[PDB]
Design a protein around this ligand. Structure first.
Ligand SMILES: OC[C@@H]1O[C@@H](OC[C@@H]2O[C@@H](O)[C@H](O)[C@H]2O)[C@H](O)[C@H]1O
Ligand SMILES: OC[C@@H]1O[C@@H](O)[C@H](O)[C@H]1O
Ligand SMILES: OC[C@@H]1O[C@@H](O)[C@H](O)[C@H]1O
Ligand SMILES: [Cl-]
Ligand code: NA
Length: 447
């Protein structure tokens, strides 16, 4: 689990896990004047890791303003940082630049400017990222197609080396959908994750206020990624504002992996309030957040919704039906497999509303609603402040009745001897007497 936010006043977060046992974290800073870096042996450890400024804007000329969206990568034995910058003479003539270091430790190492990443068209360009698919290193970025009436579109190309493209780019997406064109018509911040022989390219769209969101392109890993036809654009955002969890304009993401390498992690920013004083680019309050990516049965990523601040929620699977998870539908709790609306199946364990060391299970998509029983049936319902609700929504965490070491069971606080259990897939609180009953009342958290 993660505790969000990871880092206040850091936008466009990029985290890179290296072979040296460390995660490396860079981001845009509010002053847009430099490139910072920190490292930690764990993702959660990044929150208190100290920053080094590795590079500062030039006093005059190119690379002299709007230092935006650095990414750090390790390629062929060296570190590379990809970033965007305008000039002191023209602060909005943003182009893509690369730094290189041969040092083992990029925090203390010295950096060489490898210059601007040249592109056929001379126009507003930013958010360069690099990734390898089917043995081939690509660059993807955001750039103004001058012949289009918008801010930026998405481009992809092969690479000759980490600072030079080979051959010609392909435009693979342009901002045309209603949710891509709020305030400004933008596709930016491309980021690539691969799973099960498919490649997913997420990207950010609309202005950087509450309307900011993620879209996605999908392709096969064996396809020609430079053929625009290889890519399918999602019709609706794959990640967007949740008023319910108080998370606004989520976007400019990257992807990393958990400590064991077994879980993909979505790294992104948002704000915890909706309305912004003045111009969003002068608002410094975007913060970096982390949440696990869950993979749908159909092989596509499920980002759910931007989770509430604090500890991340978890999913509970059944002991005897390992692929079925506790979820709500029309607010009734049940176990079910292949949950498409992911957040219906996410809950966080919090101190019990009735105290005495009990626990309560708060809904991820309906904060302040909890798993609670009424007439021995389990629903997800809003805490109304009543004593009755507290008691109905509080449980004593027990070791699993069919698996004591790794399993979990939930004994009702106000009805001792009754456990949360599934029956005909619906959740209830009932006494437990048989071997099967004990299995029906045992669950796993994050398994
Ligand atoms: O559990 C609350 C909520 O119910 C599910 O949506 C209900 C669904 O909405 C209409 O389209 C249908 O009439 C009704 O069945 C959500 O998945 C869950 O969040
Ligand atoms: O930093 C993002 C850029 O700034 C604004 O012009 C638009 O939101 C986008 O093109
Ligand atoms: O919930 C599915 C099954 O329904 C009942 O027949 C069993 O107790 C339970 O395992
Ligand atoms: Cl569903
Ligand atoms: Na990026």
């Amino acid at each position: 689990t993660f505790t969000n936010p990871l880092a206040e006043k850091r936008a466009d977060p990029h985290i890179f896990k290296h072979t040296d046992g460390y995660y490396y974290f860079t981001a845009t800073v509010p002053e847009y004047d430099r490139i910072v870096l920190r490292r930690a042996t764990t993702l959660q450890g990044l929150a208190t890791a100290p920053e080094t400024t590795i590079w500062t804007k030039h006093a005059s000329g190119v690379m002299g303003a709007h230092i935006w969206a650095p990414e750090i990568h390790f390629i062929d034995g060296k570190w590379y940082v990809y970033f965007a910058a305008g000039s002191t003479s023209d602060v909005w003539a943003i182009r893509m630049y690369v730094l290189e270091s041969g040092a083992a430790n990029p925090l203390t190492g010295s950096w060489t400017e490898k210059g601007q990443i040249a592109t056929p068209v001379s126009s507003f360009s930013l958010d360069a990222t690099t990734f390898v698919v089917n043995g081939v290193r690509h660059l993807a970025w955001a750039q103004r197609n001058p012949a289009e009436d918008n801010n930026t579109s998405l481009f992809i190309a092969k690479m000759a080396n980490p600072w030079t493209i080979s051959g010609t780019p392909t435009e693979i997406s342009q901002p045309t959908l209603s949710w891509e064109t709020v305030g400004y018509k933008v596709n930016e911040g491309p980021a690539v994750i691969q799973h099960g022989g498919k490649v997913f390219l997420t990207y950010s769209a609309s202005a950087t206020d509450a309307n900011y969101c993620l879209g996605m392109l999908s392709a096969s890993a064996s396809a020609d990624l430079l053929n625009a036809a290889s890519w399918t654009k999602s019709s609706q955002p794959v990640f967007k504002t949740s008023e319910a969890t108080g998370q606004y304009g989520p976007g400019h993401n990257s992807f990393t992996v958990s400590e064991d390498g077994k879980s993909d992690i979505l790294v992104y920013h948002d704000r915890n309030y909706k309305d912004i004083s003045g111009d969003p680019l002068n608002d410094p309050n975007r913060r970096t957040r982390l949440q696990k990516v869950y993979w749908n049965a159909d092989g596509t990523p499920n980002f759910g919704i931007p989770v509430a601040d604090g500890v991340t929620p978890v999913r509970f699977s059944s002991y005897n039906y390992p692929d079925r998870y506790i979820r709500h539908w029309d607010f009734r709790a049940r176990i079910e497999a292949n949950v498409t609306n992911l957040a219906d199946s996410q809950f966080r364990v919090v101190t019990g509303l009735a105290g005495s060391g009990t626990i309560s299970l708060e809904s991820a998509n309906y904060p302040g609603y909890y798993l609670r029983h009424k007439n021995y049936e389990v629903w997800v319902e809003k805490n109304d402040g009543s004593s009755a609700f507290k008691n109905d929504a509080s449980f004593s965490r027990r070791a699993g009745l069919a698996d004591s070491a790794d399993g979990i069971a939930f004994e009702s606080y106000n009805y001792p001897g009754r456990y949360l259990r599934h029956y005909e897939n619906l959740l209830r609180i009932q006494p437990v007497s048989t071997a099967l009953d004990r299995q029906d009342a045992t669950f796993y958290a994050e398994k």
